[PDB]
Structure formats: structure tokens, C-alpha cells
Design a protein around this ligand. Sequence first.
Ligand SMILES: [Cl-]
Ligand SMILES: [Cl-]
Ligand SMILES: [Cl-]
Ligand SMILES: [Cl-]
Ligand SMILES: [Cl-]
Ligand SMILES: [Cl-]
Ligand SMILES: [Cl-]
Ligand SMILES: [Cl-]
Ligand SMILES: [Cl-]
Ligand SMILES: [Cl-]
Ligand SMILES: [Cl-]
Ligand SMILES: [Cl-]
Ligand SMILES: [Cl-]
Ligand SMILES: [Cl-]
Ligand SMILES: [Cl-]
Ligand SMILES: [Cl-]
Ligand SMILES: [Cl-]
Ligand SMILES: [Cl-]
Ligand SMILES: [Pt+2]
Ligand SMILES: [Pt+2]
Ligand SMILES: [Pt+2]
Ligand SMILES: [Pt+2]
Ligand SMILES: [Pt+2]
Ligand SMILES: [Pt+2]
Ligand SMILES: [Pt+2]
Ligand SMILES: [Pt+2]
Ligand SMILES: [Pt+2]
Ligand SMILES: [Pt+2]
Ligand SMILES: [Pt+2]
Ligand SMILES: [Pt+2]
Lengths: 171, 171, 171, 171, 171, 171
Amino acid sequence: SSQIRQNYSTEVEAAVNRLVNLYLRASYTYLSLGFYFDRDDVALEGVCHFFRELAEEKREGAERLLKMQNQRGGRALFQDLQKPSQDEWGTTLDAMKAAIVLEKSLNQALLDLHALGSAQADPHLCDFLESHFLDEEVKLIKKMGDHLTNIQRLVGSQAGLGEYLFERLTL
Amino acid sequence: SSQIRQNYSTEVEAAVNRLVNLYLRASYTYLSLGFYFDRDDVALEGVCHFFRELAEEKREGAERLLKMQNQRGGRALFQDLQKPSQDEWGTTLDAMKAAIVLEKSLNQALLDLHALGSAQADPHLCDFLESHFLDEEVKLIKKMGDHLTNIQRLVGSQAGLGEYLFERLTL
Amino acid sequence: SSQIRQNYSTEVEAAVNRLVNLYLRASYTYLSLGFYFDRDDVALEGVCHFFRELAEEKREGAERLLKMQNQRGGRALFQDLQKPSQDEWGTTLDAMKAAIVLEKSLNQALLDLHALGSAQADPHLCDFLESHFLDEEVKLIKKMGDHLTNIQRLVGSQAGLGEYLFERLTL
Amino acid sequence: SSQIRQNYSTEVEAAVNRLVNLYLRASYTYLSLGFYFDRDDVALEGVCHFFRELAEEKREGAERLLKMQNQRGGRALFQDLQKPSQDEWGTTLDAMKAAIVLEKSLNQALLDLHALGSAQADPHLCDFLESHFLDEEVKLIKKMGDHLTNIQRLVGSQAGLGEYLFERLTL
Amino acid sequence: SSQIRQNYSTEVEAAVNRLVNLYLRASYTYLSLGFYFDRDDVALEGVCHFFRELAEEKREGAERLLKMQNQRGGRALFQDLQKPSQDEWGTTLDAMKAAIVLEKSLNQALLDLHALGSAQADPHLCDFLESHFLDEEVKLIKKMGDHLTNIQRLVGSQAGLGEYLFERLTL
Amino acid sequence: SSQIRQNYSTEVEAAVNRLVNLYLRASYTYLSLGFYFDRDDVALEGVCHFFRELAEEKREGAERLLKMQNQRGGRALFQDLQKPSQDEWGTTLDAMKAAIVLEKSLNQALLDLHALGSAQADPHLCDFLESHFLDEEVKLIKKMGDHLTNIQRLVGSQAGLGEYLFERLTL
Ligand SMILES: [Cl-]
Ligand SMILES: [Cl-]
Ligand SMILES: [Cl-]
Ligand SMILES: [Cl-]
Ligand SMILES: [Cl-]
Ligand SMILES: [Cl-]
Ligand SMILES: [Cl-]
Ligand SMILES: [Cl-]
Ligand SMILES: [Cl-]
Ligand SMILES: [Cl-]
Ligand SMILES: [Cl-]
Ligand SMILES: [Cl-]
Ligand SMILES: [Cl-]
Ligand SMILES: [Cl-]
Ligand SMILES: [Cl-]
Ligand SMILES: [Cl-]
Ligand SMILES: [Cl-]
Ligand SMILES: [Cl-]
Ligand SMILES: [Pt+2]
Ligand SMILES: [Pt+2]
Ligand SMILES: [Pt+2]
Ligand SMILES: [Pt+2]
Ligand SMILES: [Pt+2]
Ligand SMILES: [Pt+2]
Ligand SMILES: [Pt+2]
Ligand SMILES: [Pt+2]
Ligand SMILES: [Pt+2]
Ligand SMILES: [Pt+2]
Ligand SMILES: [Pt+2]
Ligand SMILES: [Pt+2]
């Protein structure tokens, strides 16, 4: 019996906890992506930095969700964190394709939560997502899309050259 | 067939990957501890801050291990991350007792790795642990021990008072 | 009969003198590598600078060893310095392959000295190597490994182009 | 039953307490050396300053040992402190010969402790000594050795002159 | 046969040497007090700092006495230094009671020396003590007395609470 | 078939390579001289510094020659570097006598090269030597000559005293 809880459904509380798991999973995926590009046999520093900064962003998104859970009077509940889908991530192109899949999944989870909030008439939740998540995700996905296009135009008949140049001149 | 790998046993490589899992688990434990103390029905800001800063320290220790793995030519391999042992953490005293158990476990894992390194005649590993881990862990455990003692002296016949004062005047 | 010498075996003293010869040889190798890339028919300024800075590093490592020999009460003994293995060093790729061979040899000599120190129960020697040599060598070898990978991806079907780009955009 | 103590043998604990006694004894010896050179019938200010600064260094080394004892969960135990070996210290040459004997004894006690730590598989102790003691002692003994040589070359047929000049121009 | 000695009795010379022993003993007592409060099972940082600063003050008082001995043409003679009276010092209250006993003993030794000086018609000694010791001791004893009173009022029915608060809010 | 080579004889090219060997040999000699004076049983810091700075100067002279070889379109060719003539260098006087012998040999090699250049009508070579070498060598030899004279006047009947004073007051 929380003294502050008001207009905060058990459905939203549960879905926030699920979303925290999804963001921490994504953080973990990006940690693995980063360290893969730091391997001496991969050695793409800008690519490593791109993903390591996304691991931090996703961690921060989970903590924002956790703060909000406590502000609303819900209870944070943590579950096991699955490991990333792959141990090795291929080329930069392969990695950026996996990243945009991942971000699309996070975006769909945000949209689903927003729809739940709207069904539960929880405007504080709706505002929260609008303020801190939805535009961030659109912006990120757009950038990834721009990167994919630049990566793909650089493949040509000289894929290693293009992978180097992209890392050097964009990342 | 790594071009840089030299004097780096498969045994140490594997044990480093295990240690990364242990540090990320500990980070996750401290994240849960922090947010528990941020609950409106717990509300010990200094206690929340103490554990949130340890979550960051343990994450950083895992990334240092991961960097080193790549510097040696080993391969980072990630596993599932188990959730923390508890969902609710009791009093500050309960929490600090759990934290010192946790740190003792990390310290024993560092000592075991050092012993493995010494058995494998891997001085770079031995130096690494000595430089970045072993004294940090001793220092931390000492502080926790000092906190435990101060917490316990404050219990008296007025436990809530003592929990407040400790948070206000030490943390 | 040295007035300061304490716990410093003749075996270690001799092996330090040998190691000085190995570091001065390596310095000399890197001097030759540098000037080869400064030839008007080779003309890779960044490659020349990379090796000239390693010649200085290896010289500095020999002087550190010499200082330490005197601090321990051993006697510096110098031998002839053999010339480098090659007069011309090929491509940047050829040169970086020779450099990583060279650094692996230095690293193995450091590890052998550390093992000797450990057998002689000479912790000051062990600490010395750990403090000033072993991590430096690991770091260097990792960088060389990262460079090799980038060089090799740039070969493609356009090797001169890739050699230029690597020099311009990495070195 | 110490709550923080981990991997810290009673043997090392005891030997640390012994070492504290040895460092405080050495501090006391250097206090006596300093004040002897401040006598109006001795009057070598630079010599007085040299030893008074060593008294402070040895005190500081004992306090570092004491801090470490508490960090490990051992118990500091103090014993009587014997007075210095002499009441009057002769010439600067006599004094510097006594000082290098003293420092050799401290160095041997550090090496013995390191060997004990290594036998007990206590890497934190080994690192501690390596980090704060062993190189300091080697450096100090080297300087003393350099001073002895300069003092001895100045004896000539004019010992008072040489004692003055050394104090004026080196110390 | 000292060339500078004038109006300086053998009685005062001897009593100064005794007083140096008493001040160094007191320094040693305060070193032990300090480190006892730094134990993880005691853990009163402000109490540790209070006594460690007194160890330094008493050392400084011994060196002032030693300087003065040489200025007068007496001869410093050092004796064994007994260990402190206790290995463990109880509560802050116990420790402060021991400290004020100790300071009363030093003060009585200063007063006895002053009386000796007055009997020997040694005004330089009398002035020395008046200038650097007697008011310092009165001031110190007063502070200790103020601390004792505050400590004792805090015992109440909640002694641990009071010991914490005193350390936090006074020391 | 060098695209830039113009008026640069094979005779001069070869003699430049020889001169590089002579300068690197001299650098090596001065490295040995320096470290000999850093021995705890020799211990003449100013003498050590004098020779260590000459080792650097001679290295720099070899690199200038190597740069020039490439600017002219010649090919640097390195040979084995013989060790210095002595392992121990005696007194400062002995060492300064060896140094001036060494510098006279370098100066004669510069003059011989200049004469070769003049015979080959190579004014760029002549200017190079005039600009960067010949006056430097004259200046150096003059200083050494001034030092020798001061050293020799200090021998007297008190050679150690004079060796100390020279190191302290000139070097
Ligand atoms: Cl609900
Ligand atoms: Cl951010
Ligand atoms: Cl999974
Ligand atoms: Cl293996
Ligand atoms: Cl940190
Ligand atoms: Cl679990
Ligand atoms: Cl030996
Ligand atoms: Cl450097
Ligand atoms: Cl050869
Ligand atoms: Cl034990
Ligand atoms: Cl210091
Ligand atoms: Cl005794
Ligand atoms: Cl008298
Ligand atoms: Cl003071
Ligand atoms: Cl006693
Ligand atoms: Cl020709
Ligand atoms: Cl120069
Ligand atoms: Cl030879
Ligand atoms: Pt960035
Ligand atoms: Pt907001
Ligand atoms: Pt903080
Ligand atoms: Pt390190
Ligand atoms: Pt540079
Ligand atoms: Pt060092
Ligand atoms: Pt000083
Ligand atoms: Pt340390
Ligand atoms: Pt203070
Ligand atoms: Pt005064
Ligand atoms: Pt200089
Ligand atoms: Pt020029």
C-alpha cells in the first residue's frame, strides 16, 4: 500500500520493469559490439566507440525508467539478463544492421508502452516517454539508417577499403 | 591464431571471462541496492548514492578486464547475467552485510586469478591485478567494515534514529 | 666487492647486460626502418615517424636498464651491436610484420628475465620489469596488431592506394 | 574474528608488527644522528638535515605499515623501542657507514617479508612492499653508496677540509 | 669542556634528557591510540585524527627540547622508549581519560623542571618552558577536560549513539 | 636510378655512411662513459651528465648525416657498431683525455670528408659540413682542452679532492 501511488496501474508498473530488462539487454549487446571492434583482428576504433557510447545510453535509459518507477510508487523488479545474440559481429555493415534491428525493437516496446499508458489514461507516463525516449529513438534510428546507406555505398568491389574509410571519415 | 597473443594461457583467458561475468553481476546487484534505497518507503538518499557509485565501479572493473583480454589477444565471451540475490534489501545494516559478502567473493575471485597467473608464469596478469584490483578491493572492504561498525553502534534501542543519523552524518 | 649490492645475483646482472644489447639492437633496427621510409623512393612520412619514435623508446628502455644495473650495484658491460637484419624494408606491411616479430622477441626476453628474477627471489627486479616494461610491451604489440589488421584490409586490389591511405589517415 | 580479514596470515601479521618496530628503531637512530651533527662541537648542518629527514621517512614507513595492518584486519601491537646503538657518531664517514648498515638491515627485513608473503600466497602484501618500500630502499642505498664514495675521496691528507667541503657542496 | 656552555647545570641537562624520553613515550602512546581508533572494529576517524595529531605535537616537543639542549651546550642522551601502557584503548571516554592522565604527567614534569631551573637560577630555561610548553599544556588539558564533559553527557542510556555523535559533531 | 640525385658521387655517399658509423660509435662510447661515472664506486654526477649529453649530440649528428644522405638521393647503409674501447674509464682526467682523442678522430673524419667533397666539386656537401659540424667540433675540442687544463691543475698532491672540486664547481 504505497502512500504516493496515484493513477499508476499494475499493468504499466509491470511493463516498465520489462522495459528496464530490454534496455539493460540492449546495453549488454552494445558492450559486446564495442569490444568486438576493439579486437586486434577487427581493429575499428571509431566503430568500437560508436557502440560503447550506445551501451552507456541504453544503461541510462534503464536508470531513467527505474527512477520513474520509484517516483510513481511502483516497485523495481529485476530479472536475469540474457546474453547478446552473437559472440562475433562480422563487418561494420553486419553490426549496424543488427543495431538498427535492436533499436526498432526498443522503439516498438516504447510505442507499446505508450499505447498501454493511453489505454490506462496515464498522462504522466505518456509525457515521460514523449519527453525522454520517443524522439531520441527516432533520431538514433535515422542516424543508423544514414550510416547504413554510407556503408553500403562504400562496399563497391573494395570492401575492406570502404570499411576503413567509413570508420576514418564518418565515425 | 592470434598474431599478438604471447604467454597468455587458455586457462587465464577463460577465468578472465568468468571474472567479467562476476563483476557485471556485482554491478547489477549494486544497481538493485541503489534503487531499493530510493523507494519512497525506504528513502535513504546517501545509502542509494553509496551503492549506485559501486555499481559504476564494478562495471568499470569489468570493462578493464575486457580491455585487457583484447590487449592480450584473448576473446571476450559473454554469458547470461543472473539477477541479484534479493529483490528487497532490508535495513542499511542488512545491505552493508550483503555488500561485504559480495566484495569478499570478488576479492577471492581476484586472488584465485592471481594464483592461476602465478601457476601459469604470467607476470603481466599478476601486475595487472596488483595495479588495478587488489588494493582497491582491500580499501573497499575496509571501508565497509568501518561502516558496519558505525551502523551497529547506532542500533541501540532506537534503530530508525540510528539509521537516519548514519545516512545523514556518514554517507 | 660492491658496498650497496644486496640480493642481486650474477645471473640477473648478466642477463640485464644482455637485455641492454637487445634493446640497443632494436633501437638500431628502428633507426634503419625510419630512414628507409624517408627515402624519396619510399616517402611515407607517417611510417618514418612511427619507427623513429620507437628507436627513441628502445634507447630509453636500454638506459633505464643501465640505471637500474648501477642502482643494484651491478656493472654495465657493453658488447658490439649487430646491424639490423635488413637494409631495405619493403612495404609498410612488411615493416610492421618485422616490427611485431622484433617486439615479440623483446617481450620474450623480458619474460625470461622476470622468470629468472622469480627463481632468484629478486622482487625488486620483478617490480622493475612490471612497472616499466611488461605493460608497455603488451600495449605496443596490441597497437601493432591493430595496425597490421588495418594495413591488410587496405591491400585490396589497389595496394599503393591502401599504403598511402593508411599513412595519411592512421599514422 | 575480524569481519574484513581475508587471506592474511598470522605469520604476516606478526612480521608486520616486527617491521614497524624496526622502522621506529631506525627513525630513532636517525633522530640521534641528526642531533649529534647539530652539536656546537660537530656543527655540520647539512649532515644534521640529511639524517633528520631520514628519521621522518622511517617514521612514515612505520605508519604506512600500521595503516596496512588495519586495512588487512590485523592488529597493531607495539613493543619497547630500543635506543640507538651509539650515543656519539664520529665523523660523517662513520655516520654514513652506520646508516648504510642500517638501511641494509631494513632492506633485508623487507625482502624477508616479501618472501613470507610469497610463501603465504599474499599478493596484496607483495604489491604493497613493491609499491612503497623496495624501490625506495634501493634508491636510498644507492645514494648512500654515492655519498660514501665522495666522502672517502675527500679524506686525502686533509680530513677536516674534506668533511667541510662535502657538507657544503653535496649536502 | 663545552666552549658555549654557561650557567647550565648538569642537573638541568639530565632532567632535559629525561623529559625528552617522557615526550617521545607520550608520542608513542598517542600513535597507538590513533591506530586503535582506525581499526575496522572501532572505526572512529575523528578520534584517530585527534590522537595522531597529538603524537606529532609530542614528537615536536621532544625535538624542541633536543634543540635547546644543543643550544645550551648540553649533550643529548637517548634511552630505551617503553611501549604504551595498553594495547587496546576501550571507548573514546576511556581514551580521553588516559590522555588527560598522560598530559597531567607531562605538565608535572614541566613544572618540576621549571622548579629545578628556578633553584639553579637558570632564567633561560625558565623562559624556554614558559614560552613553548606551559601554556600549551594548560590549553590542551582544558580542551581535554571540555571533551570529557561532552563525552560523559552523551553516554545517557545510548552509549554507542553518543560515541558516534561526539566523533561526528565535535571531532 | 634515383630521380633526385644530382652531383652526388658514390665516393661521398660511401664516406657519409662510414661517418654515420663513426658518430654512432662515438655516441656508444659516451653512453658507456656516462654510466661508468654513475657507478656508486665512482659517483661523479656532473661527469656522468657531461658524457651523457655528448652521447645525445653524437647520435644527433649521425641522424643529420642520415637525413642529408636521403636529401641527396644516396642510400643509408648501416654496419655493425663496435663496442667502446674500454669497459672502465678511470679518473675524470683519464676520461677527458679519451674524449678529446675521440673528438680529434671525428674532426679528422669531417675534414677528410670535406676534402673529398672539394675534390668531387660538391659544394652542397661542403656547406653542410661547414654549417653543422666543423665549428661545433672546434668549439667542443676547445672546451675539452679548457677542462683538461683545469683538471690537471687540480691534481696537486690531493687528487681525490681535485676531482671532487672540478665536478662540483665546473661540471
Ligand atoms: Cl492497476
Ligand atoms: Cl546520454
Ligand atoms: Cl540467451
Ligand atoms: Cl594455454
Ligand atoms: Cl571509478
Ligand atoms: Cl539467479
Ligand atoms: Cl649470484
Ligand atoms: Cl618515452
Ligand atoms: Cl649481424
Ligand atoms: Cl594464519
Ligand atoms: Cl616522505
Ligand atoms: Cl638497546
Ligand atoms: Cl652543574
Ligand atoms: Cl605543532
Ligand atoms: Cl613498559
Ligand atoms: Cl660517382
Ligand atoms: Cl643538440
Ligand atoms: Cl671492438
Ligand atoms: Pt564520442
Ligand atoms: Pt520529464
Ligand atoms: Pt559521491
Ligand atoms: Pt597497468
Ligand atoms: Pt609523434
Ligand atoms: Pt620503479
Ligand atoms: Pt631538505
Ligand atoms: Pt599501494
Ligand atoms: Pt586536523
Ligand atoms: Pt624562545
Ligand atoms: Pt645539462
Ligand atoms: Pt644547412
